[PDB]
């Protein structure tokens, strides 16, 4: 189908923003160990909100890309509106670049005044640093996009893949609405904050990832749509059965009742299962490929995604998800280690997987790129992925020493925050070096086009 | 074991746990007044929350262990810096003197806050420090 070409600006933009996100990571990584680097021009928190908002916005673009490419194909017809896809692309891209500029060009509190945040205070919460008007703009874009892809599913062939995608996509946009809710009570504010972050990333985003993976395996594997869709249901069932009460693993120490200690730990202990199932899924259905496929990078991206998501989300998540352990590790470098590997392994990787399948055939090159381009893509996969394991190990070692020095001893014997950080310097230099190998990997990946 | 079976499990399981979760949320909501000592949640503390937000303190600091990991945990800072009685006075000096300008040291910005705003900030952090948090953090260092 011809209207699948609208997916292209989304994937290209996503990749540009991905580059920005890395540059800003590298800035903060240096700030950790040369603490006045770029100060006061770009203080750490400014570099941070750019790094973390560019991560979310680029994945959101990837998701829209992915939906624009596969939804027409699933529905067996043209997309409801190629021209709407294009208006929305420019509005979303313009709003994203404008708000980044906001963060970079006007001190934060000045940005708050200027966007009239005091009428409706949503600013200055983690991952939610965008002006309220800028959040509103993002809702309007999400509503547009949902109508577009949703109308396509309506007049069109329904499949379980497309309907689980639409469910995740709708749930994503609904849950975002909690970012307009800023309670005056700190505990209450934190309680509903996680309805955005956790119910996205261990809930509704899992439906999006699983559906993208499912579609890619239908196309690359020639295994039966029926068997694929059954597992897809098993996987999202386990995601929501573990993950909805599992939200409680963020409710240990924020000021809500101690029953969450039990509920949070027991249900989140099971949240690895759907990532484990996605590994059995992709390995088993690639082993049973009734046909061979010209683009051997897509298959690597798909197996790679599931292993890294399972390591980053399942294994590193489990490591700290039990309350008696989390008590010591909460808000520590161990958190940053898990957050990086989980976000990369599940979400960055699935976006690059769908791009790897869809790019050649959006550019009308064929199913695959030539053999020189395919070795580059693979080189960029291994460089980025190995670097990210090293980022995770170095921060994990830093997290262990942090907990040992700062968190375990008694008052008097425990080391102070700032003194501990100096003891962690070495792990931070290593993380920074790993971060450099990652950017190189991203360059190698990009030069594969 | 069929597609149809898997889909019904997905359906039943999501609805059940969705309802369980809202039931827990309703209950938890009713306990917050006591756990958080909401009686004390003064106009001063609520304006302090705005100051915290508007200057993105959480972009460098953790509070109750959430936020950024560049700078210290501010949930119990009141215990490392003059306690109940002298903490407001400490905070006024602390905000005025930034940045410390130690070569190579992690730097905090000058926010040019008024004394009213810093006092609201102090009341907010003092109040935060008293939330029943199930004994988190492990010690006075946060």
């Amino acid at each position, epitope marked *: 189908f011809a209207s699948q070409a609208v997916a292209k600006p989304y994937f290209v933009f996503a990749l540009i923003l991905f580059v920005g996100q890395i540059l800003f990571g590298l800035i903060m990584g240096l700030q950790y160990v040369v603490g006045d680097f770029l100060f006061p021009a770009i203080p750490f928190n400014v570099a941070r909100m750019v790094h973390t908002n560019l991560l979310i916005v680029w994945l959101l673009f990837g998701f829209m890309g992915a939906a624009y490419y596969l939804v027409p194909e699933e529905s067996d017809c043209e997309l409801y509106s190629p021209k709407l896809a294009w208006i929305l692309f420019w509005v979303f891209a313009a709003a994203g670049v404008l708000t980044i500029l906001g963060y970079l060009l006007v001190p934060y509190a000045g940005l708050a005044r200027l966007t009239g945040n005091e009428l409706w205070p949503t600013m200055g919460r983690e991952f939610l640093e965008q002006p309220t008007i800028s959040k509103a703009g993002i809702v309007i874009v999400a509503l547009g996009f949902l109508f577009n892809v949703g109308m396509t599913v309506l007049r069109g062939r329904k499949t379980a893949i497309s309907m689980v995608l639409m469910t995740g996509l709708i749930g994503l946009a609904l849950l975002f609405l909690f970012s307009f809710y800023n309670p005056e009570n700190l505990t209450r504010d934190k309680f509903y904050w996680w309805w955005v972050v956790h119910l996205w990333v261990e809930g509704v985003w899992e439906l999006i990832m699983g559906a993208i993976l499912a579609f890619v395996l239908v196309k690359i594997t020639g295994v039966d749509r029926e068997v694929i869709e059954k597992w897809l249901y098993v996987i999202i069932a386990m995601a929501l059965i573990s993950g909805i009460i599992g939200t409680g693993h963020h409710y240990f120490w924020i000021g809500v009742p101690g029953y969450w200690l039990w509920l949070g730990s027991v249900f989140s202990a099971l949240e690895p299962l759907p990532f484990f199932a996605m590994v059995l899924f992709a390995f088993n259905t690639i082993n049973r490929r009734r046909r061979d496929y010209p683009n051997r990078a897509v298959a690597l991206w798909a197996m790679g995604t599931t292993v890294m998501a399972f390591l980053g989300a399942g294994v590193w998540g489990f490591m700290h998800t039990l309350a008696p352990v989390n008590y010591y590790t909460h808000g520590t470098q161990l958190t940053a280690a898990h957050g990086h590997m989980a976000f990369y392994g599940a979400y960055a990787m699935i976006v690059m997987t769908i791009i790897s399948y869809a790019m050649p055939r959006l550019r009308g090159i064929g199913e695959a790129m030539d053999n020189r381009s395919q070795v580059l893509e693979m080189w960029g996969f291994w460089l980025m992925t190995v670097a990210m394991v090293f980022i995770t190990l170095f921060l994990s070692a830093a997290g262990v020493l942090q907990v040992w020095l700062q968190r375990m001893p008694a008052d*008097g*014997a425990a080391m*102070t925050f700032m*003194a501990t*950080q*100096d003891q962690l310097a070495i792990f931070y230099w290593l993380r920074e070096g790993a971060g450099v190998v990652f950017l190189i990997g991203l360059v190698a990946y990009l030069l594969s086009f | 074991f069929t597609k149809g079976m898997a889909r019904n499990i997905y359906f039943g399981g999501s609805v059940f746990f969705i309802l369980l979760f809202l039931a827990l949320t309703y209950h938890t909501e009713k306990t917050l007044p006591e756990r958080t000592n909401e009686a004390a949640m003064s106009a001063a503390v609520v304006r302090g929350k705005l100051v915290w937000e508007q200057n993105n303190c959480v972009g460098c600091h953790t509070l109750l262990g959430e936020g950024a990991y560049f700078a210290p945990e501010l949930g119990n800072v009141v215990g490392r810096r003059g306690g109940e009685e002298g903490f407001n006075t400490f905070l006024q*000096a602390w905000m005025k003197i930034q940045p*410390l300008n130690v070569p190579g*040291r992690r730097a905090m910005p000058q926010f040019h806050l008024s004394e009213g705003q810093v006092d609201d900030l102090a009341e907010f952090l003092k109040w935060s420090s008293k939330i029943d948090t199930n004994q988190w953090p492990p010690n006075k260092e946060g």
Partner: antibody, heavy 124, light 108 residues
Framework: EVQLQQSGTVLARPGASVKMSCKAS????????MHWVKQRPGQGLEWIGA????????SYNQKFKGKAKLTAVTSASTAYMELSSLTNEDSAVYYC?????????????????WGQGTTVTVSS | DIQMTQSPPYLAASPGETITINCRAS??????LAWYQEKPGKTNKLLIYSGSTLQFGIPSRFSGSGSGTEFTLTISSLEPEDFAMYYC?????????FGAGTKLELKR
């Protein structure tokens, strides 16, 4: 309350050695450089060196490399200075004091708490 | 090593008046100059660091300024407890070094 308690007056013969202590309380002992400073009557303060109890590293004024040895014992939150091969010029008050800032890389800073001083009197 | 020279070595003054004393470094110490108060029977007390930052709990009647090579300490309206010995110390480089002091005495 951050406090530093120094040991009492010591008397020694020329060429002998003396060792004095500084007991820290009220703060994270392993997180701050502990400095030592010499004051001879009518003579102005001199910085001898510092020890960082979080990793045992030490730093010495070149004028005191021969003279002073600095150590710390973590469990007791106490720092020590040993002065050797004593001379009349080592008769002085010796102070320990805490960096006003925590961490390893603030070696050269100012101090916020001082001990009350230990007198060393070198005589035959 | 940076040598520090304080002048004057003695200054007599009265309650209610303002005084200002000097500290000179032999080379630039950027802005990193601290001051201490010494009194009989008490431990030495940090007053100011980094040239002009008041230490926590120090009354605002004390202030200081300077950079590079030349620095001052001012007390705005002397109080009886302010008559004391005052030392400056550079905190820009190894080895740390101190001036020898200004003694502020009570005029009668």
């Amino acid at each position: 309350e951050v406090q530093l308690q120094q040991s009492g007056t010591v008397l020694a013969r020329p060429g002998a050695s003396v060792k004095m202590s500084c007991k820290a309380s009220g703060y994270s002992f392993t997180s701050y450089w502990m400095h030592w400073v010499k004051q001879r009557p009518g003579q102005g303060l001199e910085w001898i060196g510092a020890v960082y109890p979080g990793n045992s590293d030490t730093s010495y004024n070149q004028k005191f490399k021969g003279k002073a040895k600095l150590t710390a014992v973590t469990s007791a939150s106490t720092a020590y200075m040993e002065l050797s091969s004593l001379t009349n010029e080592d008769s002085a008050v010796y102070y320990c004091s805490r960096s006003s800032l925590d961490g390893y890389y603030v070696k050269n800073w100012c101090f916020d708490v001082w001990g009350q001083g230990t007198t060393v009197t070198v005589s035959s | 090593d940076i040598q520090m020279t304080q002048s004057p070595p003695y200054l007599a003054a009265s309650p209610g008046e303002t005084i200002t004393i000097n500290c000179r470094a032999s080379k630039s110490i950027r802005k990193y100059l601290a001051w201490y108060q010494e009194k009989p029977g008490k431990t030495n007390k940090l007053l100011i660091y980094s040239g002009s930052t008041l230490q926590f709990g120090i009354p605002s009647r004390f202030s200081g300024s300077g950079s590079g090579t030349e620095f001052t300490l001012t007390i705005s309206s002397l109080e009886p407890e302010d008559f004391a010995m005052y030392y400056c110390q550079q905190h820009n480089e190894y080895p740390l070094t101190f001036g020898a002091g200004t003694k502020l005495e009570l005029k009668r």
